[PDB]
Write a protein that binds this ligand. Sequence first.
Ligand SMILES: *SCC1=CC(C)(C)N(O)C1(C)C
Ligand SMILES: *SCC1=CC(C)(C)N(O)C1(C)C
Lengths: 71, 76
Amino acid sequence: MQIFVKTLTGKTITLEVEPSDTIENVKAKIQDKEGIPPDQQRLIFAGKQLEDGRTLSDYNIQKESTLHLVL
Amino acid sequence: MQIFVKTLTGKTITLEVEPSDTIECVKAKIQDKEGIPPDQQRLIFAGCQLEDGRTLSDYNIQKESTLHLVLRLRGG
Ligand SMILES: *SCC1=CC(C)(C)N(O)C1(C)C
Ligand SMILES: *SCC1=CC(C)(C)N(O)C1(C)C
């Protein structure tokens, strides 16, 4: 499924993920495509900070959702 | 040049653009200012749907023109 990650500089990155993926995995995909180290990433969805060991399904993130990335 | 983008909820947004800008760029400016994802945006001017790779000049959009923004159905 496609999701959008909006950064604070007005760049939005699109990622292809599965609900079963962990937050740690998502962060690794973002590092791979934009080079940001996972330790600098804070991911926010529906006002919750996402935790590394949970999966996207844990948070009910559905296709075409937008997560916010704060560094 | 200033252009107006009228949405279906009666909100009009003003943008500063150049005729040389592409439609893709315009959509990115709208995302930046109102948060709507480009993939949900359908831009209409003089009864044409605007295509991403063309520029505003391609369509003869002059200053103070109004484009209409229709949003693709929610989700995908
Ligand atoms: S909208 C950015 C842009 C304009 C134009 C000069 C047509 N381009 O080649 C890019 C895509 C860089
Ligand atoms: S821009 C003219 C146009 C718009 C749309 C309804 C997408 N069309 O099918 C044509 C190409 C007629």
